[PDB]
Design a protein around this nucleic acid. Structure first.
Lengths: 100, 96, 108, 83, 99, 87, 95, 108
DNA sequence: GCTGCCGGCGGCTGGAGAATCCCGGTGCCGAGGCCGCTCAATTGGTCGTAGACAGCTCTAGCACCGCTTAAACGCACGTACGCGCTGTCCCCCGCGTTTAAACCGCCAAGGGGATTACTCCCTAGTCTCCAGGCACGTCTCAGATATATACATCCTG
DNA sequence: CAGGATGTATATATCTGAGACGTGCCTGGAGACTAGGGAGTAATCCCCTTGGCGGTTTAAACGCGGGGGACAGCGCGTACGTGCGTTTTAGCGGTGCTAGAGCTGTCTACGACCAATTGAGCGGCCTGGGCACCGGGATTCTCCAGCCGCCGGCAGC
C-alpha cells in the first residue's frame, strides 16, 4: 500500500486557521524574557523586570510582528507572489514609516 | 489592608448588568475595559483642555467636551455620544 | 438634610463626581464647568455600553456567559467605526480577526 | 550544547507561527533573520524608553505600567495592564 | 526628418525639474473652489481666508507627494515603472489610512 | 441674486496635468490614465477629513470664518503637523 | 495695540551667533517659530505627563531632562542633555 | 536695585523667563520648578541653533545669503537624526529632496 | 473507409487522518455579605470670568476686462505590460531524536512602599524700569530679466 | 562603432525695487525686595515578590529525506502611455466697490471656589457554591488516489 501525505501548502492553511483563532502567545516565554533582559542589560546594569512587565512587552511585540507580517503578506500578494521575502518586509516597514 | 486604589470596576459591571443582565465579565477583559475607559477619557479631556487653552479660555464646559467628542469619535459614535451628552446635561439641569 | 449622589440627579451610573475630581487634578485647565463632568461621564458610559453590548454579543455567540478579551477584540475589530476609534490600540490576549487573502486559497 | 545567543532564542517555528497568525502561506528562508532584526529593533525602541522611565522614577525594577507608558509613547497603546 | 525625444526622458527631466523647485503644482482657483464646495455640506455660509486656503493647499500637496512616493515604491517593488491604483491602494492600506 | 451660488463638478479642477506634476514631484516616470480618479478621490477624502475638524473648530469658536490657525490645528490633530502658519 | 509674542528676536540672535553674515526670510522665520512652538509643547507635555506619572505636582529640570531623552533621538539627546545641564549649572552658579 | 535678566545669568540667548511664564500658564503642572525653564530654553536654543546652522550651510552651498523654507527642509531632511524628530511634520514651501530610484535611470 | 489502440477525462467510492460532541468527573474563583472610612454632597458666602451692548474698522467677497499660457485634443509610435512555456532548486512536510521549556518545592534578600519630622523652595504682594513690540523709513544689496556660450542626444557613414 | 547637427542647459550685465534691518517711542511684564507654608526629602521599618536552586517529564525544536510547485527567466503579441503641434479656455490681474464679520472696551451678574459638618459608596476580605476545563469515545468532516465507462484522435486500407 502507500502512505498518506498532505498536499504541500494545506497544513499551512490549517495552521493559519488555528492561530488566527487562538489567543495565546506564539513565542516561548523564557527565550523572549532572556532576550528582553539581555537587550536591557545594555541600557542599565542589574535591572529587575516585573513578571507582568515582561509579558506586556511580549504580547506587545507579538502584536507588532503579527501586524507587520500581515502587511508583508499584503505586500507580497500585491507583488503577484505567495512567498514573503525580506524585501517585502523592508517595503512594508518603509511605507509604514519605520525604516526610513 | 491599606492604600486603596481607584478604578471603573463597579461602573462597567453596572453597565453590563443593564445591557446583558445574565452575562459576566472576566478579570482580564475587565482590566482591558478599564484601560479603554482611561484612554478615551484622557483623549477627550486632552482635546477639550487643548480647546479651552486654545481659544484663550480657561473653563472647560460642556461645549468643550462636545467639540472634543465631535472631534474624536468618528461617524455615528459622535452623533450618539453628543446626543446622550446633551440629554444627560439637560436631565442634570432639570432636577436640582 | 438628607443628601444624594450627583448621578442620581443626572440619570447616570458613571461617576460624575469622580470624573469632575479627575478633571480637577488632571491639570487640564484652571477651571472646569459643572456640566462638563456630566457630559464626559455620559460619553464614557455610552462608549462603554456600546463596547460591552458588542462584546457580549460575541461572547453569547461562542455560547459563553463571561466576556473574554478575545470576544472584546472581536467586537472592537468587527465594527468599522469602533475599529477606527481604536485603530492604534492593541488588545492583549485578543489575537487577530480571522482573515485569509483569497489568493492563498486553493483553486477549488 | 549550552552556548547560545538569546537573539537566536526566537526560534524559526516561533516566527512561522507568528506569520501564520499574520496570515501568510509560504515563507522564504531569509525571513527568519529579517524578523529577528525587526524584533530586536522594536525591542530596543521600547525598552530604551522603559529604562528611561525607570531611571526617572529612581527605581531599579521595570514596571508594567512603565512598559505601557513607553508603548503608548511609541504610538502602540497597550490594554490589560492599567491605563 | 525632425528630432523627437524618447519617452521617459522628458518625464525624467520633469521629475528633476519639479523636485528641485518648490512652487505649488495645483492651480489656486480650482483648489479654492474645491475647498469651498467640500466645506458647504459641513456648515453653510462659510468664509475662507487666503491663509487658510494656503494651509490646506500646502497640506494636500505634501500629502499627495508622500502618497505618490509610496506608490512609486510599490510600483518598483512589483517590477513595474507605471503606477496603478492598486499601488495607491496598497500604500494607503499599509499606511493604515484605509485599513 | 445676492449669494448662495452653489457650484458643481469642480473636483475636475484638480486637472490631470496637476496630478502629473504632483506625481513627478513625488518621483514617478510613467503614469496610468486610471489613477487620476483614484487620486482625486483620495484628495477629496483627505480634504473632507481635514475640513471637518477645521469647521468644527470654528463652530466651537463660534466664528463664521475658517483661519489658517484652524487648518493648522486640524492638521496637527490628525498627525500631519504643518509649519509656516503661526504654529 | 494688541501686541503679539513670537520667537523672532531670539532666533535672529541665534542666527547671528552661528552665521553673523547670513540672514533669514520672513517665511522661514515663521517656520522656525512654529517649529520652536511645536517642540516646546512636545517636550513640556511629555514633562507634564512624566510628573503626573509619579504623582508629582512639580516640573523640575529632571522631568524636562527625561523628556529630552525620550523625544530627541540619540546624538540629539546626549548633546541636548549636556547643554541643558550646562545652562542650569551656569544658572545656579550665580543667582 | 540693579535689575538683571534671567537669560544673561543663565548664559542663554533664549527667553528663560518667558518660557517659565508660558509653562506656568500652559496648565502643564500645579507648580513649575526654577531650573525647568532654564533647561527647556537651553534645549530649544540648541535645537534651533543646530537647525539654523544646517540651513545656513545649505544656503551657503546654494550661493545664497538669506534662508528660505526650502533650505530648512533641505537641512532637516538631509540630516537623519533631525529627520527622525521632524518626520511627521511638513513645512510650507519646503519641497522635497531630489532623488530617483536606480531602476528609473536608462541603461547608460 | 473502419479496426484496433491509446491516451486522456471526469465521475465516482471508500480508506485516511482531523476535527468535533458530549457525558463524567473536577476543581478554582468571579460574584456576594460585612466594616467602617474617606471622601463626596450641603449650606453660606465671594468676587471675577464671561456675557450682553456698543461701537470701530479692517477685510473678505464681487464684478470686469486684457493676457496669456496652461489645459484639452489629436496623432504617430515604440515601449512596457502581460502572458505563456520552461527549467529548476528550494520551501513544505513527515519522522526520529535530542533537548530545553515548564512545573514544582524551598530560601534569602534587595527593592518597593507607607510614616515621620522638617526645611526651605516655589508661591504670593508691590514697585520699578528696561526689553520687546510696532510705526516708520530707508537704501539697500537681494532678487529678476534678457543676452551670450557648452552640453547630451540621435542620427549618419 | 566613430563624427555632426541639434534643442537644451549653463553663466552674466544691467534693472530695479519689495523689504530685512535700524531708529526711536512706548509700554507692560519680568525682576528685585519681604514672608510662608506645604512639596518633596532623608531616615526608618515592614513586607514581598524576585531571582535562584535542583528532579522529572514531555512536548517542541531540530536535522534529514523526499517531492513538487512556486518562482525567475526568456520569447512574443499589443495597445496604451508619451512626446509634440493646435486651438482655446480659464487662471491671473488690476482696477474699485461693497458691506460683513472680526475685534476691542464697559457694565454687570452669576457661577465656580472654597471652608466646616455629616453620612454612605465602596474597596477590601472571607466565602459557598457555581462555571470553565479535561477524557475518551462515538460522530462526522474533508481530502486524496485508483476503477471504470466514455471520448477524441491514430497507425494502417
Amino acid at each position: 500500500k502507500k502512505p498518506h501525505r498532505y498536499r504541500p501548502g494545506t497544513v499551512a492553511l490549517r495552521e493559519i486557521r488555528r492561530y488566527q483563532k487562538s489567543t495565546e502567545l506564539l513565542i516561548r516565554k523564557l527565550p523572549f524574557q532572556r532576550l528582553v533582559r539581555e537587550i536591557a542589560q545594555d541600557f542599565k546594569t542589574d535591572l529587575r523586570f516585573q513578571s507582568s512587565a515582561v509579558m506586556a512587552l511580549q504580547e506587545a511585540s507579538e502584536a507588532y510582528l503579527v501586524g507587520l507580517f500581515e502587511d508583508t503578506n499584503l505586500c507580497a500578494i500585491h507583488a503577484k507572489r505567495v512567498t514573503i521575502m525580506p524585501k517585502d518586509i523592508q517595503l512594508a516597514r518603509r511605507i509604514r514609516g519605520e525604516r526610513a | 489592608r491599606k492604600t486603596r486604589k481607584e478604578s471603573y470596576a463597579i461602573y462597567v459591571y453596572k453597565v453590563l448588568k443593564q445591557v446583558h443582565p445574565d452575562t459576566g465579565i472576566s478579570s482580564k477583559a475587565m482590566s482591558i475595559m478599564n484601560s479603554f475607559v482611561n484612554d478615551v477619557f484622557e483623549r477627550i479631556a486632552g482635546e477639550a483642555s487643548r480647546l479651552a487653552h486654545y481659544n484663550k479660555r480657561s473653563t472647560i464646559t460642556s461645549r468643550e467636551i462636545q467639540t472634543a467628542v465631535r472631534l474624536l469619535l468618528p461617524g455615528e459614535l459622535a452623533k450618539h455620544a453628543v446626543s446622550e451628552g446633551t440629554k444627560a446635561v439637560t436631565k442634570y439641569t432639570s432636577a436640582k | 438634610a438628607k443628601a444624594k449622589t450627583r448621578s442620581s440627579r443626572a440619570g447616570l451610573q458613571f461617576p460624575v463626581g469622580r470624573v469632575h475630581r479627575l478633571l480637577r487634578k488632571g491639570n487640564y485647565a484652571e477651571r472646569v464647568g459643572a456640566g462638563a463632568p456630566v457630559y464626559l461621564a455620559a460619553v464614557l458610559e455610552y462608549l462603554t455600553a456600546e463596547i460591552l453590548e458588542l462584546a457580549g454579543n460575541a461572547a453569547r455567540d461562542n455560547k459563553k456567559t463571561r466576556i473574554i478579551p478575545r470576544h472584546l477584540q472581536l467586537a472592537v475589530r468587527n465594527d468599522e467605526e469602533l475599529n477606527k476609534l481604536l485603530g492604534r490600540v492593541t488588545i492583549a490576549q485578543g489575537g487577530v480577526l480571522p482573515n485569509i487573502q483569497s489568493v492563498l486559497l486553493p483553486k477549488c | 550544547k549550552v552556548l547560545r545567543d538569546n537573539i537566536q532564542g526566537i526560534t524559526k517555528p516561533a516566527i512561522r507561527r507568528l506569520a501564520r497568525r499574520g496570515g501568510v502561506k509560504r515563507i522564504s528562508g531569509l525571513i527568519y533573520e529579517e524578523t529577528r532584526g525587526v524584533l530586536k529593533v522594536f525591542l530596543e525602541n521600547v525598552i530604551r524608553d522603559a529604562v528611561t522611565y525607570t531611571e526617572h522614577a529612581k527605581r531599579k525594577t521595570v514596571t508594567a505600567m512603565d512598559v505601557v507608558y513607553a508603548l503608548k509613547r511609541q504610538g502602540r497603546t497597550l490594554y490589560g495592564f492599567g491605563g
